[PDB]
Amino acid sequence: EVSQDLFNQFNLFAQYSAAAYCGKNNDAPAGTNITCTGNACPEVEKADATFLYSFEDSGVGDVTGFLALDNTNKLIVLSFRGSRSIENWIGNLNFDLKEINDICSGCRGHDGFTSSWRSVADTLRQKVEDAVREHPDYRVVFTGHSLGGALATVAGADLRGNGYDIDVFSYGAPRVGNRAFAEFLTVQTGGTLYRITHTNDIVPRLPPREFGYSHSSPEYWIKSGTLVPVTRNDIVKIEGIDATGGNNQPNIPDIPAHLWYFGLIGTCL
Amino acid sequence: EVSQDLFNQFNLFAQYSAAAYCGKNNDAPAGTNITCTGNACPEVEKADATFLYSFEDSGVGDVTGFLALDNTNKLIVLSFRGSRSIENWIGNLNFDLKEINDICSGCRGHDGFTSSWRSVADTLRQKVEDAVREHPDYRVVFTGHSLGGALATVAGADLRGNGYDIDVFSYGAPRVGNRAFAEFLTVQTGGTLYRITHTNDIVPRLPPREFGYSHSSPEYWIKSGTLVPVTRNDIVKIEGIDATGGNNQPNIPDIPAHLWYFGLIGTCL
Amino acid sequence: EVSQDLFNQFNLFAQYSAAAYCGKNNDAPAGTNITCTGNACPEVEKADATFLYSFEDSGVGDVTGFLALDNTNKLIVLSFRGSRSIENWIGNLNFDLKEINDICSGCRGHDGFTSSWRSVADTLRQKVEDAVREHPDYRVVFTGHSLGGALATVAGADLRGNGYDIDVFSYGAPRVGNRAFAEFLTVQTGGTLYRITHTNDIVPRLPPREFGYSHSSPEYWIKSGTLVPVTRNDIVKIEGIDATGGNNQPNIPDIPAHLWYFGLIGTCL
Ligand SMILES: CCCCCCCCCCCCCCCCCCCCCCCCC(=O)OC[C@@H](O)COC(=O)CCCCCCCCCCCCCCCCC
Ligand SMILES: *[C@@H]1O[C@H](CO)[C@@H](O)[C@H](O)[C@H]1NC(C)=O
Ligand SMILES: *C(=O)CCCCCCC
Ligand SMILES: *C(=O)CCCCCCC
Ligand SMILES: *C(=O)CCCCCCC
Numbered sequence: 001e002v003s004q005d006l007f008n009q010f011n012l013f014a015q016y017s018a019a020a021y022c023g024k025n026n027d028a029p030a031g032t033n034i035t036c037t038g039n040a041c042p043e044v045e046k047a048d049a050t051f052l053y054s055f056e057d058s059g060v061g062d063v064t065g066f067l068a069l070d071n072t073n074k075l076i077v078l079s080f081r082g083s084r085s086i087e088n089w090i091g092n093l094n095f096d097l098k099e100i101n102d103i104c105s106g107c108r109g110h111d112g113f114t115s116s117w118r119s120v121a122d123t124l125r126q127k128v129e130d131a132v133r134e135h136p137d138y139r140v141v142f143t144g145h146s147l148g149g150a151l152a153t154v155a156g157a158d159l160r161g162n163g164y165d166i167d168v169f170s171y172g173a174p175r176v177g178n179r180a181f182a183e184f185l186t187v188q189t190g191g192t193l194y195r196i197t198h199t200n201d202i203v204p205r206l207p208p209r210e211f212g213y214s215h216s217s218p219e220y221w222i223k224s225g226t227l228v229p230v231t232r233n234d235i236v237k238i239e240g241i242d243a244t245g246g247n248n249q250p251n252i253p254d255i256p257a258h259l260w261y262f263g264l265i266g267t268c269l
Numbered sequence: 270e271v272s273q274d275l276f277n278q279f280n281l282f283a284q285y286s287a288a289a290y291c292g293k294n295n296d297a298p299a300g301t302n303i304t305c306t307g308n309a310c311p312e313v314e315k316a317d318a319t320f321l322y323s324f325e326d327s328g329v330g331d332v333t334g335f336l337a338l339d340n341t342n343k344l345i346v347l348s349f350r351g352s353r354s355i356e357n358w359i360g361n362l363n364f365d366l367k368e369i370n371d372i373c374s375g376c377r378g379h380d381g382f383t384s385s386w387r388s389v390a391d392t393l394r395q396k397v398e399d400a401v402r403e404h405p406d407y408r409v410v411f412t413g414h415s416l417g418g419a420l421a422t423v424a425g426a427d428l429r430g431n432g433y434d435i436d437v438f439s440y441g442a443p444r445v446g447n448r449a450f451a452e453f454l455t456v457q458t459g460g461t462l463y464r465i466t467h468t469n470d471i472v473p474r475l476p477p478r479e480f481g482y483s484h485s486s487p488e489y490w491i492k493s494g495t496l497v498p499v500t501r502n503d504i505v506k507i508e509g510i511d512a513t514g515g516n517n518q519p520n521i522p523d524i525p526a527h528l529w530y531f532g533l534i535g536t537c538l
Numbered sequence: 539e540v541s542q543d544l545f546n547q548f549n550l551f552a553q554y555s556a557a558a559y560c561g562k563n564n565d566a567p568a569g570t571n572i573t574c575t576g577n578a579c580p581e582v583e584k585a586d587a588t589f590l591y592s593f594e595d596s597g598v599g600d601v602t603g604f605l606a607l608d609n610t611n612k613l614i615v616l617s618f619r620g621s622r623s624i625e626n627w628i629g630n631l632n633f634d635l636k637e638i639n640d641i642c643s644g645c646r647g648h649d650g651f652t653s654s655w656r657s658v659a660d661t662l663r664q665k666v667e668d669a670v671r672e673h674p675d676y677r678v679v680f681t682g683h684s685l686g687g688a689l690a691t692v693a694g695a696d697l698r699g700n701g702y703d704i705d706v707f708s709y710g711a712p713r714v715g716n717r718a719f720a721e722f723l724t725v726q727t728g729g730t731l732y733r734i735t736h737t738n739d740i741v742p743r744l745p746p747r748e749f750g751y752s753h754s755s756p757e758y759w760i761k762s763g764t765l766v767p768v769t770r771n772d773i774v775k776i777e778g779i780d781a782t783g784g785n786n787q788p789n790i791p792d793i794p795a796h797l798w799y800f801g802l803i804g805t806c807l
């Protein structure tokens with residue numbers, strides 16, 4: 001179980017994450033209304049939400065997404081798109097571990113995700129901090145699905161500690177690094193990480209533990225099925241590094257489960 | 270076993286379906302001859318068959334294929350390409366069910382397939398009906414492999430009942446809708462659906478039954494192996510909605526089997 | 539175990555193969571240095587290795603790679619990229635056997651790989667032979683990973699016999715033809731083929747034997763794991779057409795194993 005308020009946040013950032021896949025949301029002019037197609041983000045559309053920055057083909061690995069101003073919810077939202085292009089998929093395959101001593105000693109992260117974040121960190125840090133300067137009353141949130149959730153998690157780990165909190169909501173994110181990094185992500189302050197998984201989605205099981213990867217705690221596991229509406233009683237908070245019994249179970253994984261986080265995600269043209 | 274005449278039709282429309290994947294057959298000038306590369310479609314090439322309308326990047330979901338006039342066999346052939354582009358694949362993942370009451374009461378179809386057809390239906394209907402008017406002695410046939418077979422099935426269901434029959438030949442097609450749609454596609458008058466599957470091809474097993482999908486009856490199951498020439502004795506007709514014992518069996522599915530329907534399909538560059 | 543000298547060659551051509559995947563190495567000015575990103579090819583970077591020719595989306599099937607002049611090792615290296623684009627993948631799926639009598643009597647090869655090579659053979663032969671004339675004491679080596687190793691193997695078989703040796707180093711290459719072709723690749727004069735495999739990489743098990751495919755002899759099998767450094771003691775030479783007990787065993791195959799040949803290969807953006 002989670003609270004109705006936390007459930008509402010989970011649903012809203014799932015929709016911001018879904019919105020990052022719509023092509024028109026990666027080259028939109030600054031100041032325009034954020035919209036999706038196919039009912040992919042009705043709660044985002046209802047809000048007074050506009051683009052501060054929209055990006056595609058950025059850095060290395062085709063970093064894509066947008067930075068949104070949400071005057072209804074008083075948010076600054078950095079939403080990273082997950083995998084769509086060949087370049088995205090090739091980045092995901094760069095799965096050796098690379099030192100990220102500039103985030104934490106002993107920490108190592110996925111080479112592809114960390115290389116992609118490093119290549120855009122200066123630009124996106126500046127954009128976020130400009131938005132905070134203009135709307136210091138607002139809350140900074142980073143979000144994404146799948147690869148986008150990995151990028152949001154690395155970006156939050158890197159950019160926290162500069163005065164403003166950064167909350168991260170990830171949906172179906174892969175593991176992003178080793179046990180040291182998983183522990184760092186569990187205990188870091190200056191914001192909260194909400195790592196959301198769905199049933200037996202394969203993606204949070206990748207890369208496998210045998211390659212030196214671990215998951216941060218906690219996990220918010222959606223137990224309701226694919227195409228089934230989610231309620232607050234279908235989400236289980238699971239504590240512990242590499243905790244079993246949520247998504248990390250020794251059963252058959254599933255691909256369609258990756259595409260259903262409150263609604264369809266990754267499918268907006 | 271099937272009759273030699275039906276076998277000859279199955280082989281011919283497999284080649285029309287293969288031809289839809291050749292890029293040169295999606296942006297060809299009207300009136301030019303239909304050809305493939307290699308031995309992808311020798312029986313189409315032997316016929317006096319020309320393009321009426323060759324299309325790509327159309328509607329939503331990258332609808333691609335051609336409308337052909339076959340003066341040898343006296344056919345008007347609408348052949349849809351299956352999945353090749355990223356956009357095709359994004360459409361395939363829009364696997365929620367959407368109402369299609371304008372086709373049949375209570376029917377629901379795959380959102381991607383039905384949205385794609387809807388986006389091109391007016392244009393393609395007009396072109397088919399223009400050809401029928403000029404060539405009333407010619408038989409109208411819709412065909413395709415995989416996604417293309419799904420589009421041909423939806424299009425046939427929609428455009429039947431306007432004074433001329435439409436036969437549909439699909440090769441390795443996924444399920445396209447709910448039980449009501451499967452029943453409608455089983456009993457609809459004004460043409461026959463020939464739904465052809467091969468051994469343990471995975472695609473006719475998708476989306477899974479659990480998501481609310483069913484298959485129309487009957488099924489023409491090819492039992493001969495991959496790269497094995499098909500004879501009329503290798504094809505078995507299987508009756509019953511969601512029948513088992515043909516392609517819909519609880520065994521390990523296969524990917525190369527999806528590409529061998531009389532010959533290679535999906536591989537023409 | 540292999541000799542330290544052969545190990546050094548195996549490691550170097552693995553890095554030349556990895557370098558062919560970097561986009562910047564497929565369209566670079568002649569005479570400029572070959573480099574990669576993030577330790578994908580440090581031994582190539584250390585050498586005086588410069589572009590003689592670079593190519594992308596050549597011929598049919600998106601033939602991509604480069605021709606290098608290596609003054610440190612006295613090499614002329616033709617490195618073919620493996621699979622990245624959709625077009626590459628479609629070519630891989632063209633897995634029927636096609637006659638290659640003009641390469642060797644009785645030989646049949648994978649339709650995709652042989653069609654791709656035929657479409658670039660004249661141009662690349664001219665580039666290789668121009669380089670030979672300019673540096674007649676350098677050693678001609680063709681190399682590649684996965685599809686790129688298949689192309690290097692077919693190209694070497696075709697272009698040998700014209701007055702200079704051609705050695706081939708392939709990494710995780712699929713089978714490329716029938717038993718006659720496998721025998722020819724085992725016995726052909728005018729160069730040596732070093733066919734390198736890793737643990738239970740699936741790709742050297744494709745297409746399956748049952749489709750009419752065989753492997754040339756010998757095989758150099760890397761027994762160390764994925765993400766594990768290779769030493770010369772971890773490589774075993776296995777002789778015999780279609781020999782078992784190296785990569786060709788009846789156990790479960792693995793995908794990540796395909797990406798680790800001395801280091802990560804196929805992942806350079
Ligand atoms: C091989 C990797 C996966 C396929 C490729 C995906 C990414 C494609 C990128 C562009 C490629 C261009 C086109 C080339 C395609 C090459 C051949 C494609 C073959 C796959 C086609 C898929 C459907 C097409 C297609 O038409 O789309 C089907 C659509 O309705 C979506 O259906 C879904 O719900 C999504 C399914 C995702 C895959 C599910 C996993 C498989 C389930 C079965 C597992 C086996 C369990 C057996 C257990 C037995 C013992 C108990
Ligand atoms: C942008 O959003 C607000 C309402 O939330 C308003 O300016 C207007 O309705 C939207 N713009 C357009 C073009 O609809
Ligand atoms: C995580 O798997 C990144 C890709 C999400 C798949 C949605 C379809 C683009
Ligand atoms: C079904 O959606 C399409 C399968 C793609 C063609 C076969 C693989 C090249
Ligand atoms: C051979 O072409 C298949 C492997 C290509 C590498 C895929 C991405 C690393």
Ligand SMILES: [Ca+2]
Nearest residue numbers: 314315316318
């Ligand atoms: Ca003709």
Ligand SMILES: [Ca+2]
Nearest residue numbers: 583584585587
């Ligand atoms: Ca150098």
